[PDB]
Design an enzyme around this catalytic site. Structure first.
Site, PDB file in Angstrom:
ATOM      1  N   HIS B  11      82.159  86.587  31.442  1.00 48.49           N
ATOM      2  CA  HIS B  11      82.625  87.547  30.447  1.00 48.49           C
ATOM      3  C   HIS B  11      82.402  86.960  29.061  1.00 48.49           C
ATOM      4  O   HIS B  11      83.113  86.040  28.646  1.00 48.49           O
ATOM      5  CB  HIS B  11      84.097  87.877  30.674  1.00 48.49           C
ATOM      6  CG  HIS B  11      84.631  88.915  29.738  1.00 48.49           C
ATOM      7  ND1 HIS B  11      85.540  88.624  28.744  1.00 48.49           N
ATOM      8  CD2 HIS B  11      84.377  90.241  29.640  1.00 48.49           C
ATOM      9  CE1 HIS B  11      85.827  89.728  28.076  1.00 48.49           C
ATOM     10  NE2 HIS B  11      85.134  90.723  28.599  1.00 48.49           N
ATOM     11  N   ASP B  13      82.490  87.370  25.306  1.00 46.64           N
ATOM     12  CA  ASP B  13      82.856  87.937  24.016  1.00 46.64           C
ATOM     13  C   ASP B  13      81.857  87.469  22.967  1.00 46.64           C
ATOM     14  O   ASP B  13      81.726  86.266  22.716  1.00 46.64           O
ATOM     15  CB  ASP B  13      84.278  87.522  23.640  1.00 46.64           C
ATOM     16  CG  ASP B  13      85.297  87.929  24.686  1.00 46.64           C
ATOM     17  OD1 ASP B  13      85.688  89.113  24.703  1.00 46.64           O
ATOM     18  OD2 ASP B  13      85.709  87.065  25.488  1.00 46.64           O
ATOM     19  N   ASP B 123      87.946  93.804  30.363  1.00 41.78           N
ATOM     20  CA  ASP B 123      88.976  93.339  29.443  1.00 41.78           C
ATOM     21  C   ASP B 123      89.326  94.387  28.391  1.00 41.78           C
ATOM     22  O   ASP B 123      89.878  94.042  27.341  1.00 41.78           O
ATOM     23  CB  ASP B 123      88.533  92.036  28.767  1.00 41.78           C
ATOM     24  CG  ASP B 123      89.699  91.217  28.258  1.00 41.78           C
ATOM     25  OD1 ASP B 123      90.811  91.365  28.807  1.00 41.78           O
ATOM     26  OD2 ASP B 123      89.503  90.426  27.311  1.00 41.78           O
ATOM     27  N   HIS B 341      85.011  94.610  21.704  1.00 44.94           N
ATOM     28  CA  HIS B 341      86.448  94.813  21.530  1.00 44.94           C
ATOM     29  C   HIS B 341      87.059  93.774  20.598  1.00 44.94           C
ATOM     30  O   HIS B 341      87.881  94.113  19.742  1.00 44.94           O
ATOM     31  CB  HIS B 341      87.157  94.820  22.888  1.00 44.94           C
ATOM     32  CG  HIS B 341      86.968  93.568  23.686  1.00 44.94           C
ATOM     33  ND1 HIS B 341      85.816  93.306  24.396  1.00 44.94           N
ATOM     34  CD2 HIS B 341      87.792  92.517  23.905  1.00 44.94           C
ATOM     35  CE1 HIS B 341      85.934  92.142  25.008  1.00 44.94           C
ATOM     36  NE2 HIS B 341      87.124  91.642  24.727  1.00 44.94           N
TER      37      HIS B 341
END
Lengths: 884, 886
Positions: B11, B13, B123, B341
């Site tokens: 994941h 980011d 997420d 996000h």
């Protein structure tokens, strides 16, 4: 029959009076139309892509499917690219940055085809004196430029073409745009319009022509391609039977014009900085526009050239890897801030806000690569030579000079991971007693130091093979006195529990009289905050140093212009608040606080004069009568083992339309002075020419500027303060900050953020010397001051690397060391330096007693003919070494 | 024998607690190691590339010579990509931005091979209610998520980690819940003893919620390097545990296997997944108010692309035959790079968000360029020779799908002195000294239109022609005010400026300044000395008082969560003497300035910094607001026009205050069970009664364009631009958060973010709209959408043209519909139009273009529906319908 060569082009400033994307979207239209003419006009010869390969990248970033079409147009010879990556300002970017522009361009070009073998400087505000050698070191035999030489005096020319000789006697073919790069713009396709056009354009080019081969530049700034150029050229061939009009390119023209060159062709030598003009449009004051851009450019350039690349070059011996793609990516990000309209600070606010993002990104990649290389080096160092429970750390000298600094290193002494409440660990370390610590060398000998401060804070590790690991840790900041650390070496130390060995000797400062002295100089801070310095080795005394001068400025981002009735405010009659901040046997520092009541801005008349595009010389605005306090806080730092005085000035600028300078009266009235340029210590006169009308003479500087006679000399070094001036009485005036409100040039473009409001910090310093031979020591230490020491902690472990190791042994002498990195595919060690003097000096490099393999050019290609590795260093020679 | 599906992933980011390039350089290391395993390890099945295709782009911009290796990795089915471009926040980006993420993710995935057909929300802070329909409209039959649902075992709770997800339109997809998070299989031990204790725990955790014998182990976590020994650890697991079969697999194989043996008693969740049945402390909904300037810029750039540039360029195709697809793709990707996000939520470090501003500026400038290109091309084709000679014509465009009513301002150049005429300063003062004739507005017929000359201006200007050098000049500009009443959707009207007596607006002045009052035919406004508003709905007879009340409280939380200090009781403008001044007053438009100065704590006391550095949980924080007070002035411009019931507000502050949150209050006067708010292609119904498990004293919710509170007789709608956090208080008060200032990032450590304090000048645009019958609420929603879309005014010269002076480009089925997109398909250039039903009823929806009906109804990927739905079929409840005109 005289042949007339028409070269279609478009001079594309990447970002200027519009935001970047406004220009970027119009670049798409330009290239779309260029490719359309290529694919639809069989008689369309070629289009010159402004000498910069980034245009290809900026185009395909938006239209990637056009890559194959773009590639075919280049491989067919219809789209002429290269040789540079961008079109830079020579004086406002570092020596290495100029080289990387050609290196990146050379590598980016081979993705498309053979680039144009011509140095392209069409709009460069002054050209560096080392251009001929730098061109030849990149396999470029010719250079095209438009500013610096007046076509018809040392900087004139009876012909539009000429020879250009650098200070190292390297000569290239100079191609001046005597009628600018716009003489062939917008060629008419109508009879009555074409007759009147060619009657004067052919006349304008033959004044300065030395051959039967004329040059017509079919374009201008942001000019769309002339879609009917073939029709206009065919029309010109029918209306003028004596002239032959040929749609051509630079390569064919250069080959043609240099075949029938006359023997009486003139030669220009050295810099080309418009020194024989009225001095009103030199555009040198771009060195002071948006000083924060120059400071960020200096910091990122040092980070890549002098920190990340040397460390990564050393770390190659441990890992066998070198992050070529990451460095290439970081350099192209940094070079995107180097277009002349960008780095000069003569664009609109949105453009320069975008430059800050590029500066941050390139800096962060530079820090990442430096941290990776530093981890790889220290982890391979045999630190088991230190006792258990010790905390090792390693100091790196990543420069080519003997380094003398009083440095601080932050060592973690305890760590508590949290995986209970993390706040308990914080207060646990907060309430834990801190023992006495001691610095030791590999042999266990205690090293003098001082415990500066301790800090308990959150931290984390990012392992290469596991999840993030957060912790609460306690850090000790230890001060070390490093004396003459060898170039490109590292030394290992450690913290252990025990009584700290304190520094010994007399205190450097005498705070009751506001005085400092070591074995080199004796410093007295007068009541007004100025410095009186006595050179203890020469006996010479200098007074009224570090005086601050503020005047109004009603010009623009290009040009400084003082109001006609402005007398300026100085700190000569103020009463400085002086405080001794530090005082030790190795380091002393004073804080000089001054205030001057300055006009808040220009009066209300300036706005209408700006909106009406009134020329700045005819502006009647004066400084405002409304005042506002302007505070100047300067730190003066002296260390025991160096003759350099260090200055750090802090201001919170809330004043507009003004320029702040710091003044260093040398008391020497001399004919010439010396300034740091591009791979050159250029000599410049203090007497402007007969045609000069500007009451000021702003000049570009890189790292230092110097004024000296046969007995004494003063060297002022800086970081990002690129504009200086040598006044009549021998005073060195360095410009700290310059605040204006408009762009200038062809229209009215308000640029309020060019007023440079907010907090700023300026780093500079002085160095005194004696006989003229002692200049080059102060020049080297001026370079060294810009390169910070590298310190990093590591645990105890064995390893193949020694705790103390010299990586490169450098020939002592007046030599500037600018690059240490590795070649693209071979990963050979690449080292580059240059001679500071006009004399042949011995220069022999060794990497652990192993000689260099061969000497190369700046493209890391072996020299032809080959120069011996131990051959003496020629005057002003840029030498690059290869180690296998 | 159960099957254990181990899916390696990371994941990623894109930017968070480090500057972007620090994460970016670590992305290069990750992909280098994944390609190493793909090209060498014969047992390495695949690697899931976090559901986002931008990872491929970010990797190749640093290592372009690795493109062939990336191609071969994806072609081999070992690098699983897509189906999205980035992993976004659902509620904080526009409805179209969610679709463009799937549209670009699809088109990019097809360039490499094919996308993983799984909605990837591992997420996401709350999931939009329309997810099932949007997944189905993008050929995605399943969606994997991590937040919003609670697993139980044995409303928002599922017995199993597999479930059905049904949207408001009854569209149903397969839901895959990370019941043990997307990190349950992270760092699988490759040693015997460690593996036993690992799997004995991990297998029991997954079996707690497994409805089938197929178990999912997610081998990765946030920024996790790929496990180099994953092949060894999996073989050891098969050796140690005979009752299980461990398979290195992927989402495509797992989804096929688990859905084949799905039990009939599988649970079903419906609508939004906003963690309603949790304690309410870690919803992270307060990210909607963190760094409000990001949300304001996002709203601005999105409207610039969806509702300005694309509709104008779609119309400009009629005259040029071209559509700037590559430029729109470049602008959208630039904007989507601010939509991860951690980016748009404002929960990163300062360096990240300063970099987002650069992306916003660049995307916005491309949208402006493309709109100005289409605008010039349309106006150059309009027959302006109908106007008399020497006239200055200009064109007004309605680039929205609603009847637009607005008092418009148009700047018209009346004179122009090019630089080649003389000295620039002489031309400047020549125009400044030249007398201004009185001008008059006329339509193509020649009938005078009522207007008012606002101001004149003499300034420098230039032109950038497409075939010549720049053209500098000094010009004189006249600013004319027009009253536009119910202009048709997607149309343009042409006017001209001739010399003559101006036709003034007739009627009574809207404002009564002696009592600080305004009124038209809809509302009667009184501005009290309090500064609050007392409005009377003249059509329904309802009254509302204490409206537009400002409230400031402390906030010692972080960029994720708001938390008021325990002793803070708030500071309001209810007991303040305001300074009210009437600025404009005319028969068609009137505005009042309301000035209020209040004394606010400068920040929290010195105890907050220690509680942040020690990473103390925010609920246990003892810090209070500082006792040192500092002035804080609030200036609001209340504007009313004659032909609209919309009351517009514009609040400006110079925020020099830290650790606080400022909101504006709108007491509706009615306590209802539910309220409504604008979401993603949906007017979602949300409860006012808080759930039993909930412990947060506040209930912050996400909103897009508006929020509404109504009963059976009356209602209040509050619309905004970028003010995405709201709360409906217990007494029915709608509280819209204007700005929230904190000093730390939060989450797993201490990251000081001083620029999260949002210091400086700010302007908040919002408004009020009253309605009566509940059916009238949908008209207020359309005008709320319409308020975010400004008019496009453009001047042009006199010339013959092929376009009519007045023309309606699209005729829309009138009703409770929101219109969100008018653009064209990438290669076919088909006109694409998208709208959605606002109600739960089947409504008629026929769309026509120059009396020609649509060719076919499509999905959001602009491809025909399978099976097809008739273009004249009624619009189903909460349906997202997309048209195609060939």
């Amino acid at each position: 029959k005289k042949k007339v060569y028409i070269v279609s082009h478009s001079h594309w400033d990447r970002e200027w009076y519009l935001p970047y994307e406004e220009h970027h979207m119009r670049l798409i239209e330009l290239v779309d139309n260029v490719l359309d003419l290529i694919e639809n006009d069989p008689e369309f010869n070629s289009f010159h892509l402004d000498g910069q390969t980034i245009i290809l990248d900026d185009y395909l970033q938006v239209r990637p499917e056009k890559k194959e079409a773009v590639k075919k147009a280049v491989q067919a010879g219809k789209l002429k690219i290269g040789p540079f990556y961008i079109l830079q300002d020579d004086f406002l970017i570092s020596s290495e940055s100029n080289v990387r522009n050609m290196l990146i361009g050379h590598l980016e070009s081979q993705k498309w085809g053979a680039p144009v073998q011509l140095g392209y400087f069409p709009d460069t505000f002054g050209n560096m004196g080392q251009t001929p050698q730098m061109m030849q070191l990149a396999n470029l035999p010719a250079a095209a430029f438009g500013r610096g030489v007046k076509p018809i005096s040392d900087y004139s020319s009876q012909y539009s073409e000429m020879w250009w000789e650098g200070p190292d006697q390297t000569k290239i073919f100079g191609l001046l745009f005597a009628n600018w790069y716009s003489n062939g713009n917008e060629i008419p396709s109508e009879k009555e319009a074409a007759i009147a056009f060619w009657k004067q354009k052919l006349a304008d080019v033959e004044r300065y022509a030395s051959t039967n081969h004329l040059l017509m530049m079919n374009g201008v700034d942001h000019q769309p391609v002339q879609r009917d150029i073939t029709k206009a050229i065919a029309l010109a061939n029918e209306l003028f039977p004596e002239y032959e009009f040929i749609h051509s390119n630079f390569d064919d023209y250069l080959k043609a014009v240099q075949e029938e060159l006359p023997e009486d062709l003139g030669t220009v030598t050295g810099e080309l900085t418009s020194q024989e003009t009225d001095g009103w449009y030199t555009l040198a004051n771009t060195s002071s526009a948006r000083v924060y851009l120059k400071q960020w450019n200096t910091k990122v350039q040092r980070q890549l050239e002098n920190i990340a690349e040397p460390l990564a070059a050393m770390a190659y011996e441990v890992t066998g890897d070198y992050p070529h793609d990451q460095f290439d990516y970081a350099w192209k990000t940094l070079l995107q801030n180097h277009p002349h309209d960008s780095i000069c600070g003569c664009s609109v606010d949105e453009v320069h806000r975008g430059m800050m993002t590029r500066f941050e990104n390139a800096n962060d990649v530079g820090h990442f690569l430096a941290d990776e290389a530093t981890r790889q080096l220290t982890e391979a160092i045999d630190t088991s030579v230190f006792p258990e429970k010790a905390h090792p750390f390693v100091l790196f000298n990543t420069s080519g000079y003997q380094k003398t600094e009083v440095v601080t290193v932050e060592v973690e002494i305890e760590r508590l991971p949290f995986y209970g409440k993390p706040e308990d660990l914080y207060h646990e370390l907060k309430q834990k007693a801190t023992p006495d610590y001691q610095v030791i060398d590999p042999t266990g000998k205690a090293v003098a130091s001082r415990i500066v401060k301790e800090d308990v804070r959150f931290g984390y590790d990012l392992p290469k093979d596991a999840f993030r690991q957060p912790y609460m840790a306690k850090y000790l900041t230890v001060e070390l006195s490093v004396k003459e650390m060898a170039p490109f070496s590292w030394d290992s130390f450690a913290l252990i529990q025990g009584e700290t060995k304190a520094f010994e000797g007399s205190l450097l400062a005498q705070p009751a009289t506001n005085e400092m002295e070591n074995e080199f100089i004796q410093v007295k801070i007068e009541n007004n905050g100025s410095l009186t310095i006595a050179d203890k080795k020469t006996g010479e005394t200098f007074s009224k140093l570090l005086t601050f001068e503020d005047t109004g400025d009603i010009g623009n981002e290009y040009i400084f212009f003082k109001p006609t009735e402005d007398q300026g405010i100085t700190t000569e009659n103020v009463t400085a608040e002086i405080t001794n901040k530090e005082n030790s046997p190795v380091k002393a520092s004073y804080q000089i606080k001054q205030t001057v009541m300055l006009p808040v801005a220009a009066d209300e008349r300036l706005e209408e004069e700006q909106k009406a595009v009134r020329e700045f010389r005819e502006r009647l605005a004066q400084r405002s009568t409304t005042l506002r306090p302007f505070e100047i806080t300067t730190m003066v730092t002296m260390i025991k083992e160096s003759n350099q005085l260090f200055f750090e000035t802090t201001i919170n600028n809330q004043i507009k339309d003004h320029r702040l300078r710091v003044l260093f009266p040398t008391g020497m009235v001399t004919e010439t002075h010396e300034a740091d340029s591009i791979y050159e210590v250029v000599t410049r006169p203090n007497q402007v020419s007969d045609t000069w009308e500007n009451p000021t003479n702003p000049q570009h500087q890189q790292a230092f500027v110097n004024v000296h006679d046969q007995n004494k000399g003063v060297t002022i070094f800086n970081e990002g303060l690129n504009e200086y001036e040598v006044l009549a009485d021998g005073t060195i005036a360095v410009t700290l900050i310059r605040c204006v409100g408009e762009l200038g040039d062809w229209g009215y473009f308000a640029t309020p953020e060019a007023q440079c409001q907010g907090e700023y910090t300026f780093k500079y310093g002085l160095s005194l010397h004696g006989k003229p031979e002692e200049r080059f020591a102060t020049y080297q230490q001026a370079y060294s001051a810009q390169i910070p020491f590298t310190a990093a902690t590591t645990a105890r472990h064995e390893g193949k690397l020694a705790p103390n190791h010299v990586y490169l042994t450098h020939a002592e002498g007046p030599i500037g060391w600018t690059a240490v990195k590795r070649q693209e595919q071979t990963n050979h060690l690449v080292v580059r330096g240059f001679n500071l003097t006009a004399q042949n000096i011995p220069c022999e490099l060794h990497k652990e007693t192993q000689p260099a393999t061969c000497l190369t050019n700046v493209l890391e290609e072996p020299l032809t003919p080959a120069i011996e590795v131990d051959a003496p260093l020629r005057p002003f020679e840029i030498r690059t070494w290869r180690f296998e």
